[PDB]
From a paper:
To attach to intestinal cells ETEC express colonization factors, among them CFA/I, which are the most prevalent factors and are the archetypical representative of class 5 pili. The bioassembly of CFA/I pili is initiated by the attachment of the chaperone/minor pilin (CfaA/CfaE) heterodimer to the usher protein CfaC at the outer membrane assembly site followed by cyclic incorporation of the major pilin, CfaB. Adhesion pili subunits are assembled into helical polymers after being chaperoned across the periplasm, transported through an usher protein that resides in the outer membrane, and pilins are then sequentially added to the growing pilus filament. This pilus assembly occurs via a ‘donor-strand exchange’ during which the N-terminal extension (NTE) of each pilin subunit is transferred from the chaperone protein to a growing chain of pilin subunits, filling an empty groove in the previous subunit. The helical quaternary structure of CFA/I can be unwound under tensile force and it has been shown that this mechanical property helps bacteria to withstand shear forces from fluid motion.
We report in this work the CFA/I pilus structure at 4.3 Å resolution from electron cryomicroscopy (cryo-EM) data, and report details of the donor strand complementation. After rigid-body fitting of the subunit’s structure determined by X-ray crystallography into the cryo-EM helical reconstruction, we used RosettaCM to refine the filament structure of CfaB based upon the cryo-EM map. CFA/I pili are assembled using the NTE of subunit n fitted into the groove created by a ‘missing β-strand’ in the previously added subunit, n − 1. Calculated from our CFA/I model using CocoMaps software the buried surface area between subunits n and n + 3 is 1087 Å2, whereas the buried surface area between n and n + 1 is 485 Å2, and between n and n + 2 is 453 Å2. Our findings suggest that quaternary structural stability for CFA/I pili is due mainly to the stacking interface formed by every n to n + 3 contact, as demonstrated by this contact having the largest buried surface area, 1087 Å2. In the current structure, Pro13 has a better fit in a trans conformation, in contrast to the expectation that a transition from trans to cis would produce the rotation required for the conformational change from a linear to a helical structure. While at our current resolution, an unambiguous fit of Pro13 into the EM map is not possible, bending of the backbone structure between Pro13 and Ala14 appears to provide the rotation necessary for assembly of the helical filament.
Residue numbers in the entry:
A (entry chain I), B (entry chain K), C (entry chain E), D (entry chain M), E (entry chain G), F (entry chain C), ...: 1 to 146
């Protein structure tokens, strides 16, 4: 009754971000939208960086296009509003103090403190509800260790 | 340590239903079953419609098959009993008074009053417990603004 | 570093069926089989017809042989059980009411309501598990606009 | 504004255990740990069996591994201490008298009396606090009707 | 608007393993890695064997190479740590008692009890984080009925 | 039982583009078309350039005819809309900053950051669905290192 | 409208290797090359030997020249790295245990277990990317039944 | 640098069969053979007749010898098993209903529906694997419009 | 067992066209014809010019008669539609920019970029299917270096 | 309508070489030439010796003049580069081990394994493209059984 | 520069056989011989009779000596094995049904269907390879219209 | 063993026509005849004029009698249809532009481009097959340099 | 109807040269001439010496006048260029090794290997085309056995 399965992984020492509970982060999410408020639902997560070096500061930015579109119209576009660690992130570089994270906090060396993550996104135009339709797009959270 | 994520959304002005607390509704649920009562658990939610027009009445119905089955026998079937807003819903059209909802109620224009939602479901046959097994099926809650 | 790629497409106005989320449908699928139940896994999808004419009724049937076989024995055969839109489909013609689909539903004109799709298949014989082996076959979902 | 939802269920006549109030039981729980006492928090519930046969005695055991671990180290392990109905449960079979439960008690035939449930768990080693970290594991409460 | 689809299946009486909920098992998975712990994420599933003979004991082993590599360097290798049913599995034969599984348990004859599945994997070397890179490899879970 | 196989390859140092996961890119793709939107499906991929020189900027253009046709009428033509790296590509030369790609990002020197790829294509004429038929054509993605 | 077609085949009892799914194996393949790693892509397949005698051990080797070249320079050469069944193959004879393959495994007598196949190939020289160009060559997988 | 090329074609109005995608059909094919099943591989294609008259029924048969042989022994012979359009074909005349093909189906007038094609072939003798060797032979698919 | 073989070649410096993969081009081809579309099959190739001088522009034309006929009636004639490099070719002279070809592209000096080749051909008369019959004719692709 | 035909043949026991598929070898071939590489196209074939004695070793050489010329200038000459069976051949005698060929391989006694054949040829002078012109010459592959 | 040429022809109404493609048949052929099989190569052609009368049946036989010899020993002889139209031919008269040929088939009146032609030939003696040498002989295919 | 041989030649500067490959032209040819089409086979060659003066235009005509006859009846006659260089030739003078031939084309000065040659011939009478018999006659291709 | 015929022959043991196929050699030949190259056509044959003594070496030369002339002017003369067996021949004596010919080669004792024969001839003067005219002359190939 042999039943095979695929396995994969990705290592990248000077560890990535992870879920605060000690699991992986999502690979997807759904957001709502209320044109009575003209906002998506502000998706939120608490997360805990790990590392392999407790001093080096962590660098963050994004790829060019944190924006959605129509699943069957590539022309429609709407940006995305991202923020983590207590403030906004950009396509340009940010950098966070290692001391401001508690690597020797509750758990074990490398485990930072729990950090607020936020994924919002809004219409590009104010006072304007976008077109009725299923929309989609990807955030490619650039991040590294300085 | 770049870590990308998918995002999606769906707009449809003249807003859908939403959770009363001001969040999204469930995408899934589990129900029990007691053949000592021969009923599932009557799942319940309080919800709050939004809109983009405070006068137009809201229309409701369902798709053809609010019924479950066996996860490995498509032949087994059992209907589902749905009701919202104080009464039952059908595959045929209902319609609710806008004035009977309080769009200028506690919060802000468009926010209706909190509405009782109910998802029950029962054996198709009376005095008959169905077969032992994991069962499944989807409700496609048709709804729109008249 | 020039790297070329093939592209294709198929148009057929009075649109085909599509995935409910606003994407393409599968080109393949795998089904299980439990001879403890003597059924395949009842594969299921929610889908949304489009069109170029909101009145005309949609016609459906199948090609002659919705049946599987052995990948290395063409003699073995087992039929397939298909159903969509709330009922079974045949090699003979069905036809669905346009009004019973909600082309002016949640999204935009032409977008029907979400429709249940089902792909099951069973042994031709009752109380009979077929031969151990990888099996295969194709469904050619005839469909058009009346 | 059509918004679909998943539904599921599981039947198994000769009913499972249920919450004493007449609801479902938890699907999860959190426990603390005090190495000043070197114990988790003794989680507790009152519950009420149902059935479809008031005479047959109810059998209980567990799957092999009522033990936790580290969420990112499968090697760490610590057992779990379970007890229900007034005494301990095992990976081996127990069995409870039907008469000792009051199926004709307060409510209606089948409704047993309220039964104490207990979920504790401790370090495998005495005088030893385990490693700092989020831990996890599942109990698979085998149970049936004799 | 004819739209064809492929279908396949695989039978093998004396059934394979399946998802505990009554669905298929995954065909793929992703694991993380924290060199602060120097472990992948311990992936886990609860599963339920089926059969066509309730007495015969189930045999298990693996193919030669439960190990990963680099997607663009076949030389890199790291083993994989598998365990199911309460203990480890090997490239050599194991065998499980039928009585220790509950084929007459909650559901119906053949349906075993829910069994813990675990897929971990670690660096071959201790105190050594592997090279930064996307890695891959397959487990071919040999299994049969004794 | 000797069974021979062909092998080929193509080298071109100052590496081509590759799949972000660390595999090859597609050699083909299928696109849909909805004349309710009058768009193909916006096909998308995340990709990661490699190189042999981390400073030199990467040049891009296309061959003359990013357009489809009819498989049995060479006269029918419809252009193609391509874009990569955050913007559109042409039959004329583009050029991308090396610093804006993260060659020292998550993985190893040369591995750029993950880049959005997009393959759309539309009718040449607005408000015009093309003829019913299977269509085809090739994109020859000119690209090199400046 | 008579339209003729060629057919061929090759028998060789004591069967050759075949695709694990129950189909033929490839007649060709493409490999990449990254001089950032200085490796081709490690091509991989899972396969299942058949036979006409379940005891006899299977012998393997290769023809003299598992190496590529330039399509327009026969002088350029680079070897190929092959391995199957859990280890490397040579121009010299190997031999595999019949018992170590599971001919009475999941399917039917003769069907071995699924075996890992690997086709890699590298520059003959270390720290040396070969010349820019389309390359080619054939592997003639000698194999027989001992 | 003048480089000449041959061109040919064949017209025969009341069109021949063609590939379903809108291309030509194969001029050759290879089949396997497993004497563990004692069958070739059941080769399969989906195809779409065209015509110049939508009413007339299409006639089919074969030439005398749908059989293979040895490439260096004309005495060896083995028949071939052909079937198309949902059933078997012969050296004698068949005939298919025009209405049962959908000439006004998805595409344009004349384009029939997609039709299953099958090319199998077996040993003439049961329980008998033929001689080891490369074999060959041609099918001359007689067909016309009634 | 001496077995002799003929060899030939043709040099012409300032190289001819060649197959893009790095092989020779075809010496022949077959085209279909569908009088439901009244077109042959649009045959296509991607190709790569070479040279011995990277500046000089390449000149193209054709011989007088890019037309087919009947294999046993020289009177029947039908022209041929040729196009390469992004546009049509004639019996008169064309000329292509060297800079518009990428001789320093992916490979090595002289290797142009991949160029689309097209060989179509149609009935001389519109709304007219030619006579049933095998047809033939040659294209003599005049070409040189300006 | 009597139509006569010539037939010939050549026997020479201790068989010659033959095509690997089980057919005759070519009597002619065309080679290209790229003075951007200054090489002909490396023509290649896989072949299978036969014999009438499985032990005796096979001897090979060539006649004096494996070289081309001009079809209208006998003075022009360019040598030819031949190699078979994994290495080069000469006007002098080579000899191959019978055991190194697999006469009891896939097929039947006498049928050797598939052997790589290569026909290249180059300008006699380095850095020198020969004269523009059609060239020709014959290889007389001396070969026998030792 | 006057250059004269010979021309000839042969008419014989109630036409001879011809090549199926619409060309002449061969005037010569070469056959191999493998005394490992002790057979020549089974030469084969597909052909299409023409006529001037669609009813009359076609008669066939041969001249006395379908046999080869030595080019320098007239005493050596070996017969020839001919077959056409689905069966063997003789020095005695055969005759074929006109209706069994499709004169109103794909092309035009008179054009029969494509017919298998076969030219084999073998040693006169079994288990006997003939003498080493170039051999020759002619078949004079008697044929006419009954 | 002295063995003598005749040699001849013919010079005529301002060269004659020659075979395009760089060889002599035929001295004879055979044509078929199908009274189902009432045409001979349209014999065809590609050829390349040479010269000793690249400007002068080439003149062409024929001798009086491009017609066949019976080999044993000089009274029977049938004309011949000749055409070269893209059009018909006569017993009267034609003349071709030197510039329209490419003397500086692919090869070397004097070598014209490849020119289509055609030798057809038909019954003198329409709807009339000539007498059964071997026929013959000569074309004397007058040609010179103007 | 008595019809007589002449016969002749010539014996000369220690055999002459013969055609490689096993026939006689030509008694005549025609050569072309291109004053664009100022060469005749290089006539060529492959041939096979026989003998009556396998050791003795074969001697070759020519008679005095391997030269042509005018058929009606004996004064015009042009030499001839002969070469055989891999090199030139003279009016003086050459001699070839018996061992370098393979008398025990493919066929039977005495049959040498196939030897290249060449008959060229050129103007006596360089840069000089001879007079327009039919020319002639004989080569008397002296040859014997040393």
């Amino acid at each position: 009754v042999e039943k095979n399965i695929t396995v994969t992984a990705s290592v990248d020492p000077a560890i990535d971000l992870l879920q605060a509970d000690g699991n992986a982060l999502p690979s997807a999410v759904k957001l709502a939208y209320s044109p009575a408020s003209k906002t998506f639902e502000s998706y939120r997560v608490m997360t805990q960086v790990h590392t392999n070096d407790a001093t080096k500061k962590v660098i963050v930015k994004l790829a060019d296009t944190p924006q959605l579109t129509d699943v069957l119209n590539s022309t429609v576009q709407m940006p995305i509003s991202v923020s983590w660690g207590g403030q906004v992130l950009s396509t340009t570089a940010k950098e966070f103090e290692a001391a401001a994270l508690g690597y020797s906090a509750s758990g074990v060396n490398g485990v930072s403190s729990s950090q607020e993550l936020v994924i919002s996104a809004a219409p590009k135009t104010a006072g304007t509800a976008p077109t009725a339709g299923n929309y989609s797009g990807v955030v490619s959270l650039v991040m590294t260790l300085g």
